[PDB]
Amino acid sequence: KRVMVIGGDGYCGWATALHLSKKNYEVCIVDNLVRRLFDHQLGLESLTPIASIHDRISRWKALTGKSIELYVGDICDFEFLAESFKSFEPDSVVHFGEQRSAPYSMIDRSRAVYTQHNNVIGTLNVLFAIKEFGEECHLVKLGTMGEYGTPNIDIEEGYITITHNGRTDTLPYPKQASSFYHLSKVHDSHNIAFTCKAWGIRATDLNQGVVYGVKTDETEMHEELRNRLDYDAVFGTALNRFCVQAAVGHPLTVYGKGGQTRGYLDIRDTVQCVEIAIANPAKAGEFRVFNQFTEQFSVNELASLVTKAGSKLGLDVKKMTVPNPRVEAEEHYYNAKHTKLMELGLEPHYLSDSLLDSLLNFAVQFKDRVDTKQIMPSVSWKKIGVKTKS
Amino acid sequence: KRVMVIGGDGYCGWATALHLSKKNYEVCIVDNLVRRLFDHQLGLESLTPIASIHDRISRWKALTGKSIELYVGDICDFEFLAESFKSFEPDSVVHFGEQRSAPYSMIDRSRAVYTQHNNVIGTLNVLFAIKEFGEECHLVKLGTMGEYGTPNIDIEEGYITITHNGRTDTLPYPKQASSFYHLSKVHDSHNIAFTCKAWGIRATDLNQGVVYGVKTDETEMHEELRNRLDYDAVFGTALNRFCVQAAVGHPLTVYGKGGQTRGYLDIRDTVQCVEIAIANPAKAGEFRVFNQFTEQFSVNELASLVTKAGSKLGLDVKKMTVPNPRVEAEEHYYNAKHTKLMELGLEPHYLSDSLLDSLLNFAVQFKDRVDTKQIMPSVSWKKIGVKTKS
Ligand SMILES: NC(=O)c1ccc[n+]([C@@H]2O[C@H](COP(=O)([O-])OP(=O)(O)OC[C@H]3O[C@@H](n4cnc5c(N)ncnc54)[C@H](O)[C@@H]3O)[C@@H](O)[C@H]2O)c1
Ligand SMILES: NC(=O)c1ccc[n+]([C@@H]2O[C@H](COP(=O)([O-])OP(=O)(O)OC[C@H]3O[C@@H](n4cnc5c(N)ncnc54)[C@H](O)[C@@H]3O)[C@@H](O)[C@H]2O)c1
Ligand SMILES: O=c1ccn([C@@H]2O[C@H](COP(=O)(O)OP(=O)(O)O[C@H]3O[C@H](CO)[C@@H](O)[C@H](O)[C@H]3O)[C@@H](O)[C@H]2O)c(=O)[nH]1
Ligand SMILES: O=c1ccn([C@@H]2O[C@H](COP(=O)(O)OP(=O)(O)O[C@H]3O[C@H](CO)[C@@H](O)[C@H](O)[C@H]3O)[C@@H](O)[C@H]2O)c(=O)[nH]1
Numbered sequence A, B: 001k002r003v004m005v006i007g008g009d010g011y012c013g014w015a016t017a018l019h020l021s022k023k024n025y026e027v028c029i030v031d032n033l034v035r036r037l038f039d040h041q042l043g044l045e046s047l048t049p050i051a052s053i054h055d056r057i058s059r060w061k062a063l064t065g066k067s068i069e070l071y072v073g074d075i076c077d078f079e080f081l082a083e084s085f086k087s088f089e090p091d092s093v094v095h096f097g098e099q100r101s102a103p104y105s106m107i108d109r110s111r112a113v114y115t116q117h118n119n120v121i122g123t124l125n126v127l128f129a130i131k132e133f134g135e136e137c138h139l140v141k142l143g144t145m146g147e148y149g150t151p152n153i154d155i156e157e158g159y160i161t162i163t164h165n166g167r168t169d170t171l172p173y174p175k176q177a178s179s180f181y182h183l184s185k186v187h188d189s190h191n192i193a194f195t196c197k198a199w200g201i202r203a204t205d206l207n208q209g210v211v212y213g214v215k216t217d218e219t220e221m222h223e224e225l226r227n228r229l230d231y232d233a234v235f236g237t238a239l240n241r242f243c244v245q246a247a248v249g250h251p252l253t254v255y256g257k258g259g260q261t262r263g264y265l266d267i268r269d270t271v272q273c274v275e276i277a278i279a280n281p282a283k284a285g286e287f288r289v290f291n292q293f294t295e296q297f298s299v300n301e302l303a304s305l306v307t308k309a310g311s312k313l314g315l316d317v318k319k320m321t322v323p324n325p326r327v328e329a330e331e332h333y334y335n336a337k338h339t340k341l342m343e344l345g346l347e348p349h350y351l352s353d354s355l356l357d358s359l360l361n362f363a364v365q366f367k368d369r370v371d372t373k374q375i376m377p378s379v380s381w382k383k384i385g386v387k388t389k390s
Helices: A011-022 A032-041 A052-062 A080-090 A111-131 A182-198 A238-248 A265-278 A299-312 A353-367 B011-021 B032-044 B053-064 B079-088 B109-133 B180-200 B238-248 B267-279 B299-311 B354-363
Strands: A002-005 A028-031 A067-072 A092-095 A137-143 A157-165 A169-174 A202-208 A210-212 A252-254 A262-264 A285-293 A295-298 A319-322 B002-006 B026-031 B068-073 B092-095 B138-142 B157-166 B167-172 B203-207 B209-211 B250-254 B261-266 B289-293 B295-298 B318-322
Touching: A002 A011, A002 A080, A002 B267, A011 A028, A011 A052, A011 A265, A028 A052, A028 A080, A028 B299, A032 B167, A052 A067, A067 A080, A080 A111, A080 A137, A092 A111, A092 A265, A111 A137, A111 A182, A111 B109, A111 B180, A137 A182, A137 A265, A157 A262, A157 B157, A169 A252, A182 A202, A182 A285, A182 B002, A182 B109, A182 B180, A202 A265, A210 A238, A238 A252, A238 A262, A238 A299, A238 A353, A252 A299, A262 A285, A265 A285, A295 A299, A299 A353, B002 B011, B002 B079, B011 B026, B026 B053, B053 B068, B068 B079, B068 B157, B092 B167, B138 B167, B138 B180, B138 B267, B180 B203, B180 B289, B203 B267, B209 B238, B209 B267, B238 B250, B238 B261, B238 B299, B238 B354, B250 B299, B261 B267, B267 B289, B289 B295, B295 B299, B299 B354
Parallel strands: A002 A028, A002 A092, A028 A067, A092 A137, A137 A202, A202 A285, A210 A262, A252 A319, B002 B026, B002 B092, B026 B068, B092 B138, B138 B203, B203 B289, B209 B261, B250 B318
Antiparallel strands: A157 A169, A262 A295, B157 B167, B261 B295
8 A cells, every 4th residue: 555644754754654664555755844944943953863854765775675755845835745646646645744833833923823824724735635636545634632622521532422402413522722733733623524524535533642752663773764852842742851851850841730631652652553544444435533542641640750760760850840831721630532543453552661761761861962941931822922933 | 992894895894894883983994805806706796886995985984974994905914914903903803804605615726725724814813913912802703603514403602511421511512614614714713712711812703694685774875885795606695696596587596405404694683793792792711602693594495485575576486406516414403592692682684575575676676787697506515626717
């Protein structure tokens, strides 16, 4: 099967591209590498140095003999997207190619607008390319667990059966995103759902939880295949950030009360889940929604786990309460359902002492490359302005 | 109070601008007049000839002495929007400035993309301008009854209290839009809701039903104040279209079975409802949602009413079943709640024999200007392509 991995130079995308290639799918990467430009523009950098996309692909070929095709361009440019689609003829498209940082989407008006335009229009272009050049192509889209917000009821996998005023129906689960980025994903999902019904498009919305980890079987095969590990306050996420903080001796940055609860999963399960979604495709006109995560953790819980893990390495981990830059519930009910992927055969890598030990040791050995100036958050949800920030 | 009417040269906007001015609000119109360009580009034309926005405003001033300020520009251009906002300093902003045609949004990829970009980004710009230049400014947004789709349960006014797995919560009503235009409104609503919570913005989402009629007290005061009446298959809507069809002797174009049910309201109630929303503003951080319509009608019901009304004028109205160009339920349950505006004092103009007689006679007297080539729909929801159509 032929798979087009949009956003394949990214964190989830690169790991996924290699895995699918290893699993014998014909693979191509469609990416404009704008994420790398963001690093330069904001003064950010991955904990570990990564190779250029060209050297990454060249190394994979040198090691395995397998060639991952590369199309460098902006999917918002339909001419480029159309040519890439016609040239590659994918059977499946995995869409990781979007501005995914919540903080980034809240920097200022221009970045909030860029986030929504890039994400929503790019996804519309993908739907139109599938419809026009390969209507049977299965779209595996990365949505977000953030689409559901934190309601006082159980979170289902995309749909909910409601009995209202004596009548019953199964409707899309109410969405309550808390950032312009999270909102763009909600828009994506609604747009895709419509095309499934109107055009018979087949798609799977993967509402993934926060990803942690840097190693996967494929990326560890050579230094040039190494994935990125972000720890800064813009693109870095909770667990990965805490591990790097522990390694450099910086107190764990708990935003607000720390009761914020979310689903999490090892990057190794990210690639596994995407492969399962590709191997067991949605039917024509079907809009599948999977809650893609393996375990739920509160920020405080992650803090304790990293502290305990850090102790075994004599890191004497400390914690600190950072005035929350975000607007969100810091104490809330959280029970998100996740059985669809398990039902399809998912064999999860639950968070372990071994994983934390590995990730912490990894951070310690590259600690010299950590720019501590990027650890504390400087993007306010409430103070967001119109002047383009530098 | 000062009111900024974005989209004030349009059908709902012009009638509303005049009404608010008459009601003694200081009013300005922000419009790029792109709707007029669409008419030229698609070969469409209003049943009745309308004056230029400049002559419209000049006439109002000549008659009443009141001056409606005019800012001509694209709200997607923040520089222009920011300058207009700072120059006018509105206490309320009524947002009618969006691509509102469902068929238009389905013409091809470029038009679907234009619809979502123009609508979503323009609305984001409005929210940022309010936040930055007048945070207390009340946003009265035009959403759409189409956001709810046609579920098997009662449709509430924006929110629904659900009891799921033994827990209760009031959540946003599940959205199921059936066109790229309707979808853009869903995105708008989700975006606005977020800013109300994150920034304390105060807004009222007016999910209006289909509007019918051409006369309002103000627009009838002089020919140059005349509003537009669309009958073509792109911008024309059900009732208005049927009345013009009856007048020219064209069979009423019933799409599919004709069981499609929706809420409707006289344009006179449109201006009344907007004024009520402005006079009784939302509180800081509040996202009010009103279902703005006065009565529910199926297409078949409208067909019968127009036929009966046309009989009294000896029009011998005929009906025809047109293969539905749209993907939608042609027979469905429909019970949409609408009491919030009534509770705030709305005095509705329910559809009457008098209204139909007036509108039909109006169409008959301008029947010579009707381009019958534009009556039948030529935009398919399913056959939509990527090539920009001419
Ligand atoms: N990182 C996590 O913790 C996490 C968690 C859940 C879901 N996801 C989701 O997975 C997806 C990818 O995330 P990631 O962490 O790998 O992000 P990333 O920023 O590392 O990768 C995204 C890639 O997409 C590319 N891209 C962006 N816009 C593009 C465009 N217009 N055209 C072509 N390419 C474009 C970027 O250059 C980049 O290489 C996103 O949808 C994200 O929300 C990630
Ligand atoms: N017509 C109806 O039956 C109906 C029904 C329910 C809701 N509404 C809603 O009311 C609003 C206005 O509808 P209408 O029928 O008056 O439409 P219209 O096309 O007559 O008016 C819209 C106006 O907005 C302007 N506009 C569009 N994009 C703009 C931009 N980027 N910058 C500045 N101005 C811009 C256009 O030039 C036009 O004058 C829409 O949100 C619509 O969905 C209309
Ligand atoms: O140092 C930190 C970082 C985060 N948080 C909190 O932990 C939670 C999770 O935040 P984070 O790890 O930054 O993830 P999100 O901002 O939710 O976003 C990531 O995880 C989402 C999961 O849905 C994806 O959609 C996004 O693309 C991805 O960037 C939030 O409550 C944060 O406020 C902290 O307390 N301390
Ligand atoms: O000649 C016609 C025209 C329409 N319909 C049907 O009647 C219904 C209503 O359609 P229409 O009057 O075209 O309205 P919408 O496309 O729903 O859109 C209008 O009414 C919406 C109400 O929510 C607004 O959001 C939009 O901006 C406005 O363009 C639909 O089921 C149509 O398929 C017919 O059967 N025959």
